[PDB]
Design an enzyme around this catalytic site. Structure first.
Site, PDB file in Angstrom:
ATOM      1  N   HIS A  96      15.318  -7.291   8.496  1.00 32.26           N
ATOM      2  CA  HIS A  96      16.560  -7.830   7.976  1.00 32.26           C
ATOM      3  C   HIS A  96      17.186  -8.826   8.936  1.00 32.26           C
ATOM      4  CE1 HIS A  96      19.020  -6.927   4.510  1.00 32.26           C
ATOM      5  NE2 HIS A  96      20.146  -6.957   5.252  1.00 32.26           N
TER       6      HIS A  96
ATOM      7  N   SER B 117      13.153 -12.071   4.716  1.00 35.58           N
ATOM      8  CA  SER B 117      11.822 -12.325   4.178  1.00 35.58           C
ATOM      9  C   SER B 117      11.344 -13.714   4.566  1.00 35.58           C
ATOM     10  CB  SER B 117      11.839 -12.265   2.690  1.00 35.58           C
ATOM     11  OG  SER B 117      12.306 -11.011   2.258  1.00 35.58           O
TER      12      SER B 117
ATOM     13  N   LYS C 280      12.609  -9.834 -11.576  1.00 35.82           N
ATOM     14  CA  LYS C 280      11.217 -10.209 -11.343  1.00 35.82           C
ATOM     15  C   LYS C 280      10.359  -8.997 -10.944  1.00 35.82           C
ATOM     16  CE  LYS C 280       8.473 -13.887  -9.237  1.00 35.82           C
ATOM     17  NZ  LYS C 280       8.506 -15.080  -8.372  1.00 35.82           N
ATOM     18  N   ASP C 281      10.920  -8.026 -10.204  1.00 39.07           N
ATOM     19  CA  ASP C 281      10.245  -6.769  -9.876  1.00 39.07           C
ATOM     20  C   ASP C 281       9.906  -5.948 -11.128  1.00 39.07           C
ATOM     21  OD1 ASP C 281       9.911  -7.255  -7.066  1.00 39.07           O
ATOM     22  OD2 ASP C 281      11.865  -6.272  -6.554  1.00 39.07           O
TER      23      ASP C 281
ATOM     24  N   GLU D  97     -12.836   8.886   0.638  1.00 37.69           N
ATOM     25  CA  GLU D  97     -12.315   8.151  -0.506  1.00 37.69           C
ATOM     26  C   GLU D  97     -12.450   6.646  -0.297  1.00 37.69           C
ATOM     27  OE1 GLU D  97     -11.323  10.000  -3.458  1.00 37.69           O
ATOM     28  OE2 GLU D  97      -9.190  10.114  -2.860  1.00 37.69           O
TER      29      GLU D  97
HETATM   30  C1  HEM Z   1       5.017   2.534   2.451  1.00 43.28           C
HETATM   31  C2  HEM Z   1       4.512   1.328   2.677  1.00 43.28           C
HETATM   32  C3  HEM Z   1       5.361   0.113   2.618  1.00 43.28           C
HETATM   33  C4  HEM Z   1       6.494  -0.189   1.893  1.00 43.28           C
HETATM   34  C5  HEM Z   1       7.211   0.675   0.853  1.00 43.28           C
HETATM   35  C6  HEM Z   1       6.833  -1.529   2.259  1.00 43.28           C
HETATM   36  C7  HEM Z   1       7.915  -2.196   1.667  1.00 43.28           C
HETATM   37  C8  HEM Z   1       8.232  -3.506   1.986  1.00 43.28           C
HETATM   38  C9  HEM Z   1       9.234  -4.255   1.337  1.00 43.28           C
HETATM   39  C10 HEM Z   1      10.056  -3.764   0.161  1.00 43.28           C
HETATM   40  C11 HEM Z   1       9.285  -5.479   1.932  1.00 43.28           C
HETATM   41  C12 HEM Z   1      10.214  -6.606   1.549  1.00 43.28           C
HETATM   42  C13 HEM Z   1       9.682  -7.219   0.233  1.00 43.28           C
HETATM   43  C14 HEM Z   1       8.280  -7.777   0.320  1.00 43.28           C
HETATM   44  O1  HEM Z   1       8.004  -8.728   1.105  1.00 43.28           O
HETATM   45  O2  HEM Z   1       7.319  -7.340  -0.349  1.00 43.28           O
HETATM   46  C15 HEM Z   1       8.295  -5.524   2.932  1.00 43.28           C
HETATM   47  C16 HEM Z   1       8.131  -6.612   3.794  1.00 43.28           C
HETATM   48  C17 HEM Z   1       7.179  -6.488   4.806  1.00 43.28           C
HETATM   49  N1  HEM Z   1       6.305  -5.490   5.074  1.00 43.28           N
HETATM   50 FE1  HEM Z   1       6.170  -3.844   4.139  1.00 43.28          FE
HETATM   51  N2  HEM Z   1       6.013  -1.985   3.192  1.00 43.28           N
HETATM   52  C18 HEM Z   1       5.105  -1.061   3.449  1.00 43.28           C
HETATM   53  C19 HEM Z   1       4.012  -1.090   4.281  1.00 43.28           C
HETATM   54  C20 HEM Z   1       3.792  -2.167   5.107  1.00 43.28           C
HETATM   55  C21 HEM Z   1       2.668  -2.324   5.924  1.00 43.28           C
HETATM   56  C22 HEM Z   1       1.492  -1.359   6.047  1.00 43.28           C
HETATM   57  C23 HEM Z   1       2.876  -3.505   6.631  1.00 43.28           C
HETATM   58  C24 HEM Z   1       2.031  -4.126   7.687  1.00 43.28           C
HETATM   59  C25 HEM Z   1       0.844  -3.763   8.157  1.00 43.28           C
HETATM   60  C26 HEM Z   1       4.108  -4.077   6.240  1.00 43.28           C
HETATM   61  C27 HEM Z   1       4.554  -5.240   6.815  1.00 43.28           C
HETATM   62  C28 HEM Z   1       5.620  -5.864   6.172  1.00 43.28           C
HETATM   63  C29 HEM Z   1       6.046  -7.185   6.629  1.00 43.28           C
HETATM   64  C30 HEM Z   1       5.489  -8.010   7.784  1.00 43.28           C
HETATM   65  C31 HEM Z   1       6.993  -7.577   5.758  1.00 43.28           C
HETATM   66  C32 HEM Z   1       7.728  -8.880   5.809  1.00 43.28           C
HETATM   67  C33 HEM Z   1       6.938  -9.818   4.896  1.00 43.28           C
HETATM   68  C34 HEM Z   1       7.748 -11.049   4.550  1.00 43.28           C
HETATM   69  O3  HEM Z   1       8.712 -11.022   3.742  1.00 43.28           O
HETATM   70  O4  HEM Z   1       7.364 -12.130   4.981  1.00 43.28           O
HETATM   71  N3  HEM Z   1       4.612  -3.227   5.304  1.00 43.28           N
HETATM   72  N4  HEM Z   1       7.679  -4.281   2.956  1.00 43.28           N
END
Ligand code: HEM
Ligand SMILES: CCCCCCCCCCCCCCCCCC(=O)OC[C@H](COP(=O)([O-])OCC(O)COP(=O)([O-])OC[C@@H](COC(=O)CCCCCCCCCCCCCCCCC)OC(=O)CCCCCCCCCCCCCCCCC)OC(=O)CCCCCCCCCCCCCCCCC
Ligand SMILES: CCCCCCCCCCCCCCCCCC(=O)OC[C@H](COP(=O)([O-])OCC[N+](C)(C)C)OC(=O)CCCCCCCCCCCCCCCCC
Ligand SMILES: CCCCCCCCCCCCCCCCCC(=O)OC[C@H](COP(=O)([O-])OCC[N+](C)(C)C)OC(=O)CCCCCCCCCCCCCCCCC
Ligand SMILES: CCCCCCCCCCCCCCCCCCCC(=O)O[C@H](COC(=O)CCCCCCCCCCCCCC)COP(=O)(O)OCCN
Ligand code: HEM
Ligand SMILES: CCCCCCCCCCCCO[C@@H]1O[C@H](CO)[C@@H](O[C@H]2O[C@H](CO)[C@@H](O)[C@H](O)[C@H]2O)[C@H](O)[C@H]1O
Ligand SMILES: CCCCCCCCCCCCO[C@@H]1O[C@H](CO)[C@@H](O[C@H]2O[C@H](CO)[C@@H](O)[C@H](O)[C@H]2O)[C@H](O)[C@H]1O
Lengths: 55, 273, 438, 61, 402, 124, 124
Positions: free
Chosen positions: B92, B96, B118-119, B162
């Site tokens: 935050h 993004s 959009k989601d 798996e």
């Molecule tokens: C339970 C698993 C996860 C949830 C619920 C989750 C959820 C989210 C959400 C809601 C966002 C903001 C919206 C979006 O960009 O899609 C986000 C951004 C991000 N997530 Fe995750 N995430 C998860 C796992 C991960 C994993 C495994 C990684 C990295 C290895 C990760 C790295 C990031 C990064 C770098 C962003 C920023 C991307 C950007 O907006 O440029 N997340 N995540």
């Protein structure tokens, strides 16, 4: 700026447990909040461990 | 870097969570998968065997192991939710990123109603896929051997994880040493932590980088091939192929991305003079 | 290579010390006395400063008005200041007006009237001074700093003294003070600029020969201070600038660590946002403070007395929500004098000091002040060659060893004035005097 | 009551030997003892507690 | 100070017996020559910024290794850039000045982020003293332009990078540059300046746009930060007697805790006010000023009346004693000015850049009581009195009341 | 990688006749296939800006250059969200693809790197 | 409850001779047993201040009254944390227990309540 203030994650902890400004005259009855946190931590640790053996 | 690094831990927690949940059925794949995966810990030098017996709570996978996996499988999703929340709070501070790789501070939209609505589209697309598997093909993604009760005597024909763990299993097979293989398999996930360093580009993202896009395409397809090789038999010629794919996997991080990103920096500069 | 400081004595034990400069046309002669407020007790605290006022209020010969006229006719001026351990009375004049100025100084020191009428008149002037220092924030901060660091000890007292004493100082106690303290073995007649030493010695024999000698002549600059870690907070939300001093117990004039403490002080150094070059200084603290706008200024100091000193820093800041950062980063820079300094910082600070100690003396008054200070604190003028050798002897090991025993994990005296809500409590400040990582 | 340069009386609390190494060393001995018992207590706690995961008596039988 | 010439540049040096040398470049670029208001202040602050051979950062870091110091100031007549260092480090300092005059990169970010903010803090610090403001206001009324231009950059009229670059193109030229070395071997300096400043443009002498015109008037700078009042009298023919008269009338005390025996000092008795008479020679015109500051506008007004009376009384009769006291106080003031490095540099700078030979303190003329009283009489009977009031201006005097 | 690095390496290549003969045509093709000009960007608009050094360089842009950059970023964002490409005068022509930012960032980095060097000086 | 209410009810009691004869002595003992004077407080120092109305009344205190209130709060806090009581001149004497704040809060509340009434006026 100190890291504990600059980094957003550290700053949340900082705001609650370190720089949090408290009244200077809390008496011992203000200590039950941290005792309740301790009970919650003990119940989580013992409870999860019991769940490994309980059917 | 911080939301990404916490994200890598989220991914490790998801793997552990899913592995423990799969054991809980206590079919043949449950038991034999637990046995072979937990025996990888025996490779830890000096204390490895002791650690395995401690994890199992006995001398083989049995009741103690199943009851502890239940308690941990219940817990681990809560830990996972906390880390998911942490990576969003870390994000935050910058907001993004976006597909062009530039700042969006010039042009912002509220999350609601735009991204809420959009989601919903992808939620309903996901629910359609969910429906097709859950109601019409509920066992397509599973192994029939998990409908046979665990039997420590009979070994199943092929013990595989798996599908989503298969690439990491192919990487482990590629190294002949037991400890070597375990290290490689863990390194295959932890190496994601060095992407912030090895990407030397002055530009964020691949939208405008034709060579990086080709390399990324090869990296992804190689990752899928590793997945396939994770479930073939240990036979020619898949043994050598698995080793070559493993080298490609690591050389993306260590060699190719640093080289390609360096050269593209120069091409953008010279090409636009 | 500067001309040699000549030094002679009289029979009473008055030292005469001179440094001629044939390129200037003015001369500063004066009397440096090894005596100041610290020689008072609690009852006559304020006397030394009271006398300084009366010294210009008329003598047995010249009245107040005649005194004014005599100095006006000389062409130059007279000046005086009383500190905790030193009193000075000097006269800047033309080359050939030096015998007049020596005669006037000798008169106001030996033969001052201290008339009850004048005592009573100044008693109001000095009372008004008590309510107007309040504006000189740096002085307010340093006087509170001495008061707390040397709590209930003579060095802790102010120079003005309490209001109560000002109303009860008599001509008797004034006379007693200057009879006990202004003795020949405690006094140095100093001349700098267009002065001849042999001429000045003759003038000393003419005017200061009937000075009392003390019963027990100790050497010049002869003195037990027990530093108190402590804090004074003078919060004033209506002031825009916070003034903060932090100090530890430092070194005396004759300490073996005197140069090591100066080098350590130069590693932190000074900073002022109003000076153009200050954003480019090499000091780490300078860089932190300037990049983050933490302060308007800071000034490192290493104040020495005969038997103790205070070493520390004085900060001024309008950044009232980041006072914590300012104090934090400053004390973490002090930690590094113990943990991290190497030949890099030490040799840079030595280079800067080798010049700085010479640069400071750029006029006759500065030269006279240097001869007078050194003669009344060390008993001798130390040649620049000796000073260059003592600085060269300071190694990085010396700085680290000094900081580890003087700064590291030590009590501080802390004074804050102004909008200092953001200055944390004593423990959190004092906890930055060490590093848990080391 | 009025002058702020006259420090209030702290003589009931001030230690005479406050700047000595002995004085600091005593307080660090108390802090250190506390840290020592906390380390030994944590070690005991963790060892006894985590041993629940090692094979139970019926399994070892 | 042995005056010479090295590669078209006037160089004056005086060897001494000290480890400390002062090298000053005096530039004919003070505010009377300023193309746009405040440019000479900005150019002064742009010295020792980034040059092509050496960045401002690198210069400061190396200056700290030599333990040298840097002092700059702007007057109505000059910009003075002074360095203080150890004798042996002379070549470095000569080369640094050469880089500044030949190769300063005047970059927009330096102006916005470095130079202009420092110039603004400089001015605000000066104006904290209401007497500074009053004397500045008085020159503005008396001369309007040239000598009446502000010395310092002000916010209401912004200096641009093109303004500063143009002015520097004029000023940084062999015709507008004098080098003054205190405790510098004169032969050594000539050799170094001769190699370092050889490729500096020759340029042309900077000149005041328009002749100096004198005017009377009033300025009423309403501030909330202290009270002051200047009574100035513009002088069409600058004469050295006004130095003696300024020192005679006096104002400051020569002794701690005293009022003083000078007429203006005696005008302040019973008031918490100070006074100072000053005389400013600018070659072609002069300004004789009496500035009074204090906290009470009523007391300032009271002193102001006594001050103008003092001047009239002096125009009547001076005693021989008083005339001798004036000679003594004036010789002393001359001597200490030739000692102070800031004023010293400008004095020889004026000798080198103009042709006004310095009056040695030992050659300060003794003015008879006749000559002093005559000088005071001309001032009391001036057609063009200037009065600048600062502070509670509704409560301060006006010219017609004085 | 620092802009300084990229610029210096590029200058080594442009000096070598052989190297330039083989690299310059490749670089021009690369830029054509990159396609950032089809969203009306100039190359320098793409450089990562969330860095102290880059934020300082952007603050030093002349106001005109700064206002034009803001418009190109907004315009490209609108093409991106609409899944359209620039047409006509919105397409960046090769002669308009000027390195407006490179001089500012090179000066910021020059000082930053000199400061690092001078922080490590050793009096000899 | 509003200060207005408390003040009005008190005034009804003080008016009634019977009521005052029985209530005033009780109120005086209550205050003695309350013991806030033994921490150097004045009664009005105890009034809850975390409301818009009270924040406005405190902002309207004359500066000297305001600075003295800050000192009494700090002093009482230091007695509280030390588990000591005031002695000597720190004890609030009955003649020093003045209602310094009541007039300010009554004016703030007067306007607040008039505004509420007038928000509900009906043109007849
Ligand atoms: C339970 C698993 C996860 C949830 C619920 C989750 C959820 C989210 C959400 C809601 C966002 C903001 C919206 C979006 O960009 O899609 C986000 C951004 C991000 N997530 Fe995750 N995430 C998860 C796992 C991960 C994993 C495994 C990684 C990295 C290895 C990760 C790295 C990031 C990064 C770098 C962003 C920023 C991307 C950007 O907006 O440029 N997340 N995540
Ligand atoms: C459960 C897990 C165990 C952990 C223990 C936590 C308990 C600590 C706590 O909150 O109570 C301690 C607590 C001491 O707290 P303190 O901070 O010293 O004072 C809090 C009050 O202000 C103290 O009020 P005070 O200053 O007015 O002193 C009163 C107190 C004396 O207080 C003491 O210091 C004891 O004595 C009594 O009230 C005794 C009642 C008379 C009986 C006859 O003791 C009491 O207050 C007991 C009174 C309760 C009735
Ligand atoms: C299989 C190989 C995939 C290669 C993709 C190459 C780019 C492409 O054409 O994609 C279309 C688009 C191209 O989009 P774009 O954002 O580059 O361009 C949009 C159009 N222009 C350039 C005009 C602005 O790429 C994506 O949307 C890529 C997202 C990648 C997700 C990959 C998931 C694999 C999971 C394995 C994890 C380990
Ligand atoms: C629950 C487990 C507790 C582990 C504590 C074990 C030893 C650490 C300790 O005592 O901390 C002392 C140390 C030091 O205490 P200190 O911070 O008072 O000491 C600093 C000053 N010197 C180094 C001069 C003594 O604290 C820490 O390092 C923090 C860790 C505590 C957890
Ligand atoms: C249970 C075991 C007790 C905690 C053991 C910690 C080590 C104790 C000694 C270490 C110590 O005193 O050093 C401090 C560490 O304390 C700390 O940093 C922690 C201070 C106290 C920790 C307890 C916090 C509240 C406990 C209540 C439970 C909370 C509810 C949640 C379950 C440093 O700190 P310093 O600033 O004094 O250093 C001064 C200069 N370095
Ligand atoms: C606020 C936290 C909790 C409270 C107040 C609580 C309370 C209790 C109580 C009263 C019992 C009955 C104990 C007995 O008499 O034997 C119990 C049993 C149990 N609890 Fe919890 N509990 C908590 C948290 C947990 C958690 C997080 C788990 C994780 C699974 C858990 C697992 C168990 C199990 C397995 C038992 C049954 C075995 C036994 O009786 O000891 N508890 N709990
Ligand atoms: C109790 C265990 C420790 C973990 C912390 C508890 C997790 C809860 C934290 C998330 C809730 C958000 O918490 C919120 O954080 C910000 C900064 O962090 C705090 O903000 C506060 O501190 C920061 C600096 O320390 C200032 O900028 C701010 O003016 C001040 O109000 C909020 O007062 C707090 O409400
Ligand atoms: C990061 C932490 C490092 C890993 C933590 C290690 C986990 C388990 C380590 C040892 C646990 C068992 O280790 C074993 O513990 C029990 C106490 O608990 C000890 O047993 C000892 O005390 C218990 C009761 O306290 C008695 O029943 C026993 O007869 C006695 O020998 C054993 O002497 C020790 O061998």
């Amino acid at each position: 700026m100190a890291l504990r203030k600059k980094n957003s994650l550290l700053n949340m902890a900082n705001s609650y447990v370190l720089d949090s400004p408290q009244p200077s005259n809390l008496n011992y009855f203000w200590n039950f909040g941290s005792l309740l946190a301790l009970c919650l931590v003990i119940q989580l640790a013992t409870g999860i461990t019991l769940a490994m053996h309980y059917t | 870097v911080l939301p990404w690094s916490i994200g890598v831990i989220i991914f490790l927690l998801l793997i552990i969570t899913a592995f423990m949940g799969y054991v809980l059925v206590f079919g043949q794949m449950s038991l034999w998968g637990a046995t072979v995966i937990c025996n990888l810990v025996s490779a830890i030098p000096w204390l490895g065997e002791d650690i395995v017996h401690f994890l199992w709570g006995g001398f083989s996978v049995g009741n103690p192991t199943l009851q502890r996996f239940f308690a941990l499988h219940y817990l681990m999703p809560f830990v996972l939710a906390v880390f998911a929340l942490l990576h969003l709070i870390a994000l935050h501070t910058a907001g993004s990123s976006n597909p062009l790789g530039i700042t969006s501070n010039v042009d912002k939209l509220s999350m609601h109603p735009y991204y809420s609505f959009k989601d919903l589209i992808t939620v309903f697309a996901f629910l359609l896929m969910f429906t097709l598997f859950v109601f019409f093909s509920p066992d397509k993604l599973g192994h029939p051997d998990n409908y046979i009760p665990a039997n420590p005597m009979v070994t199943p024909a092929s013990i595989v994880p798996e599908w989503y763990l298969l690439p990491f299993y192919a990487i482990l097979r590629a190294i002949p040493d037991k400890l070597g293989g375990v290290i490689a398999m863990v390194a295959a996930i932890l190496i994601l932590l060095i992407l912030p360093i090895v990407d030397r580009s002055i530009i964020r993202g691949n939208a405008f980088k034709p060579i990086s896009k080709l390399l990324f395409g090869f990296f992804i397809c190689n990752f899928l091939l590793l997945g396939v090789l994770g479930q073939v038999h240990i036979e020619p010629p898949f043994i050598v192929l698995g080793q070559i794919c493993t080298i490609f996997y690591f050389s993306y991080f260590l060699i190719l991305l640093p080289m390609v990103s360096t050269i593209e920096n120069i091409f953008f500069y010279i090409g636009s003079l | 290579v500067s001309p040699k400081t000549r030094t002679s004595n009289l029979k009473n034990g008055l030292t005469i010390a001179s440094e001629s400069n044939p390129l200037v046309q003015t001369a500063t002669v004066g009397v440096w006395i090894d005596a100041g407020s610290r020689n008072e007790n609690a009852y006559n605290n304020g006397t030394a400063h009271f006398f300084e006022h009366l010294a210009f209020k008329g003598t047995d010969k010249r009245s107040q008005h005649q005194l004014e006229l005599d100095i006006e006719n000389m062409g130059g001026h007279l000046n005086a200041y009383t500190s905790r351990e030193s009193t000075v009375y000097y006269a800047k004049s033309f080359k050939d007006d030096v015998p007049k100025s020596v005669e006037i100084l000798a008169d106001i020191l030996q033969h001052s009237k201290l008339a009850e009428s004048a005592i009573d008149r100044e008693r109001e002037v000095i009372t008004r001074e008590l309510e107007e220092v309040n504006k000189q924030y740096e002085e307010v901060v340093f006087d509170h700093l001495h008061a707390t660091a040397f709590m209930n000890q003579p060095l802790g007292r102010t120079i003005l003294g309490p209001r109560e004493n000002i109303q009860t100082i008599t001509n008797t106690e004034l006379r007693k003070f200057i009879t006990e303290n202004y003795t020949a073995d405690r006094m140095v007649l100093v001349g700098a600029g267009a002065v001849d030493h042999d001429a000045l010695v003759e003038l000393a024999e003419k005017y200061f020969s009937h000075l009392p000698s003390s019963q027990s002549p100790v050497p010049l600059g002869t003195p037990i201070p027990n530093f108190v870690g402590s804090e004074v907070r003078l919060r004033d939300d209506t002031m825009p600038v916070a003034h903060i001093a932090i100090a530890v117990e430092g070194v005396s004039w004759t300490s073996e660590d005197y140069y090591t403490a100066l080098v350590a002080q130069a590693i932190i150094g000074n900073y002022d946002r109003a000076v153009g070059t200050s954003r480019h200084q090499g000091s780490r603290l300078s860089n932190i403070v300037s990049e983050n706008n933490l302060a308007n200024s800071f000034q490192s100091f290493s104040t020495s007395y005969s038997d103790t000193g205070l070493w520390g820093i004085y900060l001024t800041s309008e950044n009232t929500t980041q006072i914590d950062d300012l104090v934090h980063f400053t004390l973490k820079e002090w930690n590094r004098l113990s943990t991290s300094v190497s030949n890099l910082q030490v040799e840079r600070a030595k280079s800067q000091l080798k010049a700085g100690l010479l640069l400071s003396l750029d006029g006759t008054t500065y030269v006279a002040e240097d001869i007078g200070r050194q003669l009344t604190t060390l008993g001798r003028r130390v040649t620049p060659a000796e000073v260059e050798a003592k600085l060269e002897a300071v190694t990085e090991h010396d700085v680290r060893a000094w900081a580890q025993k003087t700064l590291y994990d030590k009590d501080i005296a802390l004074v804050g004035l102004g909008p200092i809500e953001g200055l944390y409590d004593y423990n959190r400040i004092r906890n930055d005097m060490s590093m848990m990582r080391w | 009551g009025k002058s702020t340069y006259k420090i209030p009386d702290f003589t009931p609390y001030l230690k005479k030997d406050r700047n000595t190494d002995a004085n600091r060393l005593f307080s660090y001995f108390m802090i250190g003892s506390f840290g020592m018992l906390s380390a030994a207590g944590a070690k005991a706690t963790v060892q006894d507690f985590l041993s629940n995961m090692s094979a139970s008596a019926d399994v070892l039988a | 100070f042995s005056t010479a010439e090295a590669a078209g540049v006037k160089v004056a040096a005086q060897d001494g017996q000290s480890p400390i040398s002062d090298l000053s470049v005096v530039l004919r670029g003070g505010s009377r020559y300023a193309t746009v208001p405040g440019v000479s202040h900005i150019l002064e602050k742009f010295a020792f910024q980034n040059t092509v051979p050496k960045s401002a950062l690198r210069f400061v870091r190396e200056l700290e290794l030599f333990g040298g110091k840097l002092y700059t100031h702007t007057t109505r007549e000059h910009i003075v850039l002074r360095t203080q260092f150890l004798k042996q480090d002379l070549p470095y300092f000569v080369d640094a000045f050469a880089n500044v005059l030949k190769e300063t990169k005047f970059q927009q970010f330096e102006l916005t982020e470095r130079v202009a903010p420092v110039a603004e803090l400089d001015l605000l610090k000066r104006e904290s003293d209401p007497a500074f403001t009053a004397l500045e206001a008085a020159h503005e009324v008396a001369f309007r332009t040239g000598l009446g231009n502000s010395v310092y950059a002000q916010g209401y009229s912004p200096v641009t990078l093109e303004d500063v670059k143009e002015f520097a193109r004029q000023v940084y030229a062999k015709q507008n540059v004098a080098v003054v070395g205190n405790n510098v071997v004169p032969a050594d300096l000539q050799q170094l300046v001769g190699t370092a400043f050889a490729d500096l443009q020759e340029g042309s002498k900077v000149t005041q746009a328009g002749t100096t015109t004198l005017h009377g008037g009033e300025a009423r700078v309403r501030t909330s930060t202290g009270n002051a009042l200047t009574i100035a009298l513009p002088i069409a023919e600058p004469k050295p007697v006004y130095h003696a008269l300024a020192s005679f009338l006096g104002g400051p005390a020569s002794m701690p805790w005293s009022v003083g025996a000078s007429p203006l000092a005696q005008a302040t008795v019973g008031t918490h006010t100070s006074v100072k008479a000053t005389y400013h020679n600018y070659g072609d015109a002069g300004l004789f000023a009496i500035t009074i500051k204090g906290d009470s506008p009523a007391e300032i007004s009271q002193v102001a009346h006594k001050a103008v009376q003092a001047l009239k009384d002096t125009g009547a009769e001076v005693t021989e004693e008083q005339a001798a006291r004036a000679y003594a106080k004036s010789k002393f003031a001359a001597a200490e000015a030739f000692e102070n490095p800031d004023s010293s540099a400008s004095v020889i700078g004026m000798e080198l850049l103009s042709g006004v030979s310095r009056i040695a303190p030992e050659n300060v003329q003794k003015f008879t009581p006749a000559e002093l009283s005559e000088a005071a009489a001309q001032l009391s009977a001036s057609a063009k009195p200037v009065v600048a009031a600062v502070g509670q201006v509704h409560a301060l005097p006006f010219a017609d009341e004085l | 990688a620092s802009i300084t690095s990229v610029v210096k390496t590029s200058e080594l290549i442009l000096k070598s006749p052989l190297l330039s003969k083989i690299v310059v045509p490749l670089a021009k093709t690369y830029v054509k296939f990159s396609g950032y000009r089809q969203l009306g960007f100039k190359m320098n608009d793409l450089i990562i800006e969330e860095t102290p050094n880059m934020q300082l360089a952007l603050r030093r842009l002349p106001p005109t250059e700064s206002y034009d950059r803001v418009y190109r970023l907004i315009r490209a964002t609108q093409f991106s969200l609409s899944h359209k490409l620039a047409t006509g005068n919105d397409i960046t022509k090769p002669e308009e693809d000027d390195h407006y930012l490179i001089p500012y960032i090179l000066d910021v980095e020059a000082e930053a790197f000199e400061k690092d060097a001078l922080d490590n000086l050793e009096v000899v």
